[PDB]
């Protein structure tokens, strides 16, 4: 296991933090969040959606081919 | 609400962890009463007469 | 045949997304078991004491219990005697062993009726559909006369003769004992005689939803304020020379 | 004597657009199994198709005035 | 100086749950590790309170379960908390393994291989678990799975009979399965603490796959509160499933006592075994069936040997992302098919998906990584 | 050179009671801690139930 | 602790569950026992410290 | 088995019917008190030798 003060060497990086009591928990929750969430979705839809569509259509065809098979039409 | 109700709630109860705890446990007891039957009353309205508690007086000695 | 048909979705007073059982109709449905399905159908997991506070009072339940002979534990002499029904008694066993069900109920074996709306796919809607949806055999297929006919039954044929016909009893407190009524009540009783806790879970579930509705935004608010020190932090890199 | 709500509202169900349509193909199956010599092209199928369309309607209205 | 740092019990807790240097950027996908721990404990506390009123014999097994639900005060909640927690434990397992693949976490060899052993053990647990009620599905599910072990060449029959305590899934088997189902969650917990030991030796991975030593934050309060919020969601998902739909995931056949003669039409696993059931049923051969089921899970022990990419995570790897979701959607296929009979549309696509699971992990994703490397001129 | 380091403007994140540079924060510290501690007290009360 | 008004049906099965779990808790408490111990090492018959002859 | 109806009989079943079950049964019963003689030796030693100071 590792602890602070032994992790790695870092030089020249200032970090400015604020107390939680001085700031608001939801700065711009809907005015920034919604722009972000669509942006996040658009970033991944072409990478996550296409196999699920491909599954869905195999599922819907497969089940439709299941029932429309055991019933006859001639003698 | 003159120096804010939240400010006076902090200075009177929230400051010390002792009075903070005491406010929670006193508050947990009050809230349990107002919620148990308060939510049971809402459960009454969606089942207006179809419960045995409403039927009751129909079969009484 | 093997090809199937499924139950619709009859809008019960308890299959609503949060709604309790109709307590007036759990009552009526007990009777629909009491002098109709008690003669070929076991209900081993429901006792008389269970009916108390639900449909009947303390007296009414004892009064219904006393109505039949129960084989009580051995006396001092060493033989088993027969006593009137107490509150703590189980619902009467019609057959001593399921092999007697075979020989004395037209070849087939009738299943246990406690946990019936939970052991058949579609539940009570299925039992209502099997009970109410009785019809005459189709062309081409002949029902072997030791077996009846139902469309909702998986094999289309087999076993059960239907006592769901208009008025097999008059309902205690001013109610017309029709086909759709006499089928509805058994199902509204068999729901309770499969899942008694029904009302309580739904009561608790509402409390859970109201609790979570208060708790989920509040814990999120606790998280955000703690995380805010990181979520607004500004970095600057100032390398030398 | 005795007015059953099932058969009172079942007559409104049998008299529906998709319902009679499923009885038409049932009847044409009837007058072909009865008409032919000794087939096995039986009508357990078309029977269930009618009851599918019919009992779907039954559920919608049945419980409106049941005591 | 500091009591919380130097005490030979508080020190060990401090370095695991308080002062632990954790990455600043770990997703909600990192929550499942703690959520598994919650699930494991939840199963223990419902499990024990169930074990208090439950009997192990054929004569009383089914009835004691009913006795709990009907007669025992609030026994019905404990019973369904258990049953639903079992599969809630599986959704977390699936999220957690999935995340490991996506983010390249598996590169931690020891901690990952221990996790595979955790999976096999939790699944060996649940399989022994469902048998205990002695319903129709309990028996015939038990029968279907055990009978597979008859295929192991020279050693075949002697093994199955040894696990059986006889020539079928009998009296001996119920009680025996109970004992194993009592002990295994404790062994799970012990293996889960070694899992956490090996892990803390490196610290967590993060969404980027780059090392986070340059931006570590303390596990408290940030991940104490993120895990507190996450657990509230777990209770929501577990309790909506318990107080509204306690049998949605459950098979109705298990509500009729076991009959060793009358065998049911469908043999339906609980959802968490459906993908694996599919892989097994797809292959016609007896020996091959079991060896494919075995391979379906032991494959995760190969994934590290088949890391080909210069990057750790899939975060900056588009081709690999597509191949990953193909694996998830394919696993969604195996699931649905597992819960279907072995008739016409289902034999073919079920067999096809099986080949795809293996070709995707064993060949396809290892190729994507080589191409992805080449496109970056690496 | 270290004298160029001003803290970035936080107005975007600041609770409204402490947006005024000419206003003492002490005036609003009581009310501000109050809110976040009330949230916590209410949370524990809910958990307790 | 009885599950009723005497040592009944409930008590047997309940006692079984507790008798299954307790030896595992025992083992966990026994490993902490060994942790605290190794922090000093063993005592010896003399009661004088043995750091000079380990 | 954990029920009143079968508790006593299952114990007998182990000894009589289960292969080498009689040894497992008595190994347990005697090990229980063997565990106690060791506990007593161990606590006694702790008193005698002042080990308790840990
Ligand atoms: C309807 C319900 C919507 C449910 C969607 C919840 C998704 C989270 C979302 O709220 O935040 C993203 C988003 C903010 O995005 P962002 O600016 O990029 O935030 C930075 C990060 O996302 C940082 O975001 P974050 O740190 O605030 O959220 C992280 C995460 C997620 O947070 C939770 O989802 C929030 C809990 C819901 C509380 C709401 C109360 C509802 C009653 O918290 C935990 O880690 C949870 C882990 C649990 C794993 C799940 C295991 C379960 C089994 O908020 C969206 O605006 C909300 C959705 C829009 C709804 C429109 C309807 C109007 C009302
Ligand atoms: C099986 C059960 C599936 C249900 C999800 C269970 C919750 C999973 C939880 O563990 O992860 C929390 C996770 C938040 O974690 P985080 O620490 O902020 O990190 C982001 C992801 O880990 C990393 O993902 P990312 O940084 O690439 O961003 C993903 C982002 C996720 O952003 C928000 O969480 C989505 C909040 C919108 C609520 C949508 C309600 C669905 C109706 O957006 C989503 O792709 C779709 C948003 C749907 C809105 C657009 C549709 C129009 C309406 O939220 C879920 O992933 C969102 C599920 C979105 C599915 C909606 C599909 C609609 C098409
Ligand atoms: C493990 C499996 C279970 C899963 C559980 C998951 C669900 C989440 C619930 C987990 C509990 C989390 C609690 C929520 C965190 C809030 C933090 C809380 O603990 O408060 C802390 C402090 O704790 C409380 O002060 C203690 C109050 C005690 C209230 C009583 C609790 C009820 C228990 C009853 C006690 C009686 C004993 C029972 C006898 C039979 C710190 O407060 P803080 O936000 O930093 O404010 C600082 C304090 N100030 C204001 C003075 C500066
Ligand atoms: C030990 C760990 C256990 C601590 C649990 C911490 C709590 C987790 C918070 C999650 C929020 C849960 C939603 C809240 C729902 C609840 O409030 O609804 C009330 C409702 C009762 O309503 P009534 O029947 O009208 O009550 C009659 C008597 N007054 O209760 C709910 O069903 C229970 C909620 C279940 C939450 C699940 C918590 C998970 C932890 C389970 C472990 C249990 C350990 C207990 C064993 C202790 C040993 C003696
Ligand atoms: C086995 C049982 C199979 C059941 C399948 C379950 C049904 C599918 C549900 C899938 C839910 C997916 C949620 C959608 C979120 C996701 O798509 O968003 C993409 C987004 C991209 O983010 P970054 O690369 O970090 O970039 C962010 C930069 N801002 O998030 C992540 O990639 C998602 C992380 C993947 C975790 C795995 C989740 C998939 C769950 C299925 C389990 C995986 C199967 C494991 C194999 C087990 C075999 C024994
Ligand atoms: C009174 C209103 C009832 C109710 C609610 C039910 N029955 Fe009977 N039943 C009998 C037999 C021999 C069978 C077996 C037929 C077969 O082989 O399946 C049954 C079957 C049932 C079922 C099971 C069907 C299913 O859901 O799959 C159900 C739900 C059911 N019954 C409910 C015999 C009798 C009988 C004596 C001849 C009487 C009286 C009843 N049944 C009455 C009822
Ligand atoms: C082989 C798959 C595997 C399984 C199954 C698995 N683990 Fe893990 N686990 C890992 C890996 C790899 C990591 C490292 C993840 C990382 O840091 O990104 C990890 C991380 C974790 C973490 C730290 C938090 C986090 O999510 O990173 C915990 C806690 C956890 N595991 C516990 C468990 C528990 C409990 C189980 C169920 C008995 C389990 N894991 C099942 C491989 C798995
Ligand atoms: C309070 C009485 C006490 C009991 C009961 C006791 N321990 Fe110990 N144990 C001690 C002490 C004190 C020592 C330190 C002895 C020493 O080093 O001289 C010790 C030493 C030991 C040792 C190291 C070897 C040795 O004998 O010094 C082991 C191992 C051990 N304990 C395990 C156990 C186990 C297992 C149990 C049964 C669950 C147990 N002990 C019961 C107090 C006890
Ligand atoms: C204290 C011993 C105990 C522990 C620990 C335990 N269970 Fe169980 N579990 C039981 C008993 C007894 C039953 C039978 C009663 C019942 O079905 O509710 C059972 C039932 C089950 C069932 C059948 C569910 C149902 O009702 O249909 C599953 C599945 C299961 N457990 C999985 C698990 C998993 C997974 C774990 C955690 C690795 C676990 N259990 C922890 C004793 C235990
Ligand atoms: C008891 O039966 C069932 C249980 C359930 N929870 O679904 C199902 C009804 C059943 C089981 C399906 C199934 C599919 S797949 C599987 C399984 C059991 S066991 C296992 C392996 C991977 C684990 C081995 C662990 C070995 C260690 C002891 C070293 N896979 N079981 O359906 C036939």
Give a structural overview:
This is part of a larger assembly, with 1 copy of chain A (75 residues), 1 copy of chain B (61 residues), 1 copy of chain C (241 residues), 1 copy of chain D (67 residues), 3 copies of chain E and 1 copy of chain F (49 residues). Chain A has 1 helix and 1 strand. Chain A is mostly helical. Chain A is elongated, with a radius of gyration of 27 Å. In chain B, 70% of the residues lie in helices and 0% in strands. Chain B is built from 3 helices and no strands. Chain E has helices at residues 3-6, 10-18, 32-51, 58-70, 75-102, 109-131, 136-146, 156-164, 171-200, 219-243, 274-282, 286-298, 318-338, 344-375, and strands spanning 21-23, 216-218. In chain E, α5 (75-102) crosses α10 (219-243). Chain E is 65% helix and 2% strand. Chain F is mostly helical. Chains C and E meet through α6 of C and α4 and α10 of E. β1 (13-16) of chain A pairs antiparallel with β3 of chain C. One cardiolipin (CDL) sits between chains E (28, 31, 226, 229-230, 233-234, 237) and A (30, 32-34, 36-37). Chain D: Keywords: Acetylation, Disulfide bond, Electron transport, Membrane, Mitochondrion, Mitochondrion inner membrane, Respiratory chain, Transit peptide, Transport. Chain D: The modification N6-acetyllysine is found at residues 18, 61. Chain D: It is a peripheral membrane protein. Chain D: One of its GO terms (biological process) is mitochondrial electron transport, ubiquinol to cytochrome c. Chain D: This is Cytochrome b-c1 complex subunit 6, mitochondrial.
Structural class given helices, strands, pairing of chain B?
A: mainly alpha
Terminus-to-terminus distance of chain B: 55 Å
Query: What is the CATH top level name of chain B?
Result: Mainly Alpha
Largest sheet data of chain B: none
Task: Report the CATH superfamily of chain E.
Answer: Cytochrome Bc1 Complex, Chain C
Strand order of the largest sheet of chain E: 1-2
Q: According to CATH, what is the topology of chain B?
A: Single alpha-helices involved in coiled-coils or other helix-helix interfaces
**Helix content estimate of chain E:** 55-70%
**What is the C-level CATH assignment of chain E?**
Mainly Alpha
Q: Strand portion of chain B, in percent?
A: under 5%
Enumerate how many helices of chain E there are, as a single number: 14
């Amino acid at each position: 296991g590792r602890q602070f003060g032994h992790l790695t060497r870092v030089r020249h990086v200032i970090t400015y933090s604020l107390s939680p009591f001085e700031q608001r928990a939801f700065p711009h929750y809907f005015s920034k969040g919604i722009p972000n969430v669509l942006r996040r979705t658009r970033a991944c839809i072409l990478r996550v959606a296409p196999p699920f569509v491909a599954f869905y259509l195999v599922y819907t065809w497969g089940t439709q081919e299941f029932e429309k098979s055991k019933r006859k039409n001639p003698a | 609400v003159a120096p804010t109700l939240t400010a006076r709630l902090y200075s009177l109860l929230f400051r010390r962890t002792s009075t903070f705890a005491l406010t929670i446990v006193v508050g947990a007891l009050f809230f349990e009463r107002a919620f148990d039957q308060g939510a049971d009353a809402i459960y009454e309205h969606i089942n207006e007469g179809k419960l045995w508690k409403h039927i009751k007086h129909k079969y009484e000695n | 045949s093997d090809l199937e048909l499924h139950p619709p979705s009859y809008p019960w007073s308890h299959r609503g997304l949060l709604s309790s059982l109709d307590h007036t109709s759990i009552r009526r449905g007990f009777q629909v078991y009491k002098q109709v399905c008690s003669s070929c159908h076991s209900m081993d997991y429901v006792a008389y004491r269970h009916l108390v506070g639900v449909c009947y009072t303390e007296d009414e339940a004892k009064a219904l219990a006393e109505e039949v002979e129960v084989q009580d534990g051995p006396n001092e002499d060493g033989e088993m005697f027969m006593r009137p029904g107490k509150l703590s008694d189980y619902f009467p066993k019609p057959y001593p062993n399921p092999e007697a069900a075979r020989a004395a109920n037209n070849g087939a074996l009738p299943p246990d009726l406690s946990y019936i709306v939970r052991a058949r796919h579609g539940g009570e809607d299925y039992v209502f559909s099997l009970l109410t949806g009785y019809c005459e055999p189709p062309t081409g297929v002949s029902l072997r006369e030791g077996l009846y006919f139902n469309p909702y039954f998986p094999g289309q044929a087999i076993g059960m003769a239907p006592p769901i016909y208009n008025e097999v009893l008059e309902f205690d407190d001013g109610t017309p004992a029709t086909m759709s009524q006499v089928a509805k009540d058994v199902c509204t009783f068999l729901r309770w005689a499969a899942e008694p806790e029904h009302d309580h879970r739904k009561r608790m579930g509402l409390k859970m939803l109201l609790m979570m509705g208060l708790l989920l935004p509040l814990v999120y608010a606790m998280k955000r304020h703690k995380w805010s020190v990181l979520k607004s932090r500004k970095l600057a890199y100032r390398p030398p020379k | 004597e005795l007015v059953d709500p099932l058969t009172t509202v079942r007559e409104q169900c049998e008299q529906l657009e998709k319902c009679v349509k499923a009885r038409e193909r049932l009847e044409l199956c009837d007058e072909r199994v009865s008409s032919r010599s000794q087939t096995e092209e039986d009508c357990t199928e078309e029977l269930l198709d009618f009851l599918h369309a019919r009992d779907h309607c039954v559920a919608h209205k049945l419980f409106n005035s049941l005591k | 100086t500091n009591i919380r740092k130097s005490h030979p019990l508080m020190k060990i807790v401090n370095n695991a749950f308080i002062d632990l240097p954790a990455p600043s950027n770990i997703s909600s996908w990192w929550n499942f590790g703690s959520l598994l721990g919650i699930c494991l404990i939840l199963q223990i506390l419902t499990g024990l309170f169930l074990a208090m009123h439950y009997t192990s014999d054929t004569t009383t097994a089914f009835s004691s379960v009913t006795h709990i639900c009907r007669d025992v005060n609030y026994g019905w909640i404990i019973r369904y908390m258990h049953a639903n927690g079992a599969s809630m434990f599986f959704i977390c397992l699936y999220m957690h393994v999935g995340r490991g693949l996506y983010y390249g976490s598996y590169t931690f060899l020891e901690t990952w291989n221990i996790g595979v052993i955790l999976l096999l053990t939790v699944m060996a647990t649940a399989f022994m678990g469902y048998v205990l009620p002695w319903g129709q599905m309990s028996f015939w599910g038990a029968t279907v799975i055990t009978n597979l072990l008859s295929a192991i060449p020279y050693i075949g029959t002697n093994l199955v009979e040894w696990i059986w305590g006889g020539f079928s899934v009998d009296k001996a088997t119920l009680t025996r399965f109970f004992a194993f189902h009592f002990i295994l969650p404790f062994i799970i917990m012990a293996i889960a603490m070694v899992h956490l030991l090996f892990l803390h030796e490196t610290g967590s991975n993060n969404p980027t796959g780059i090392s986070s030593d340059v931006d570590k934050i303390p596990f408290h309060p940030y991940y104490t509160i993120k895990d507190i919020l996450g657990a509230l969601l777990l209770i929501l998902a577990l309790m909506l499933l318990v107080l509204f739909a306690p049998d949605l995931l459950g098979d109705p056949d298990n509500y009729t006592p076991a009959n060793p003669l009358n065998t049911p039409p469908h043999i339906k696993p609980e959802w968490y075994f459906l993908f694996a059931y599919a892989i097994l049923r797809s292959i016609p051969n007896k020996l091959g069936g079991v060896l494919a089921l075995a391979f379906s899970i032991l494959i995760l022990a190969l994934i590290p040997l088949l890391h080909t990419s210069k990057q750790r995570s899939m975060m900056f790897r588009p081709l690999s992302q597509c191949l990953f979701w193909a694996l998830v959607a394919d696993l969604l296929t195996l699931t649905w098919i597992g819960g279907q009979p072995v008739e016409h549309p289902y034999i073919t696509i079920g067999q096809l998906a099986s080949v795809l699971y293996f070709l995707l992990i064993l060949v396809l994703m290892p190729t994507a990584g080589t191409i992805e490397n080449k496109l970056l001129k690496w | 050179s270290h004298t160029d380091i001003k803290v970035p403007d936080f107005s975007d994140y600041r609770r409204p009671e402490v947006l005024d540079s000419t206003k003492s924060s002490k005036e609003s510290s009581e009310a501000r801690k109050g809110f976040s501690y009330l949230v916590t007290a209410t949370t524990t009360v809910g958990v307790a139930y």
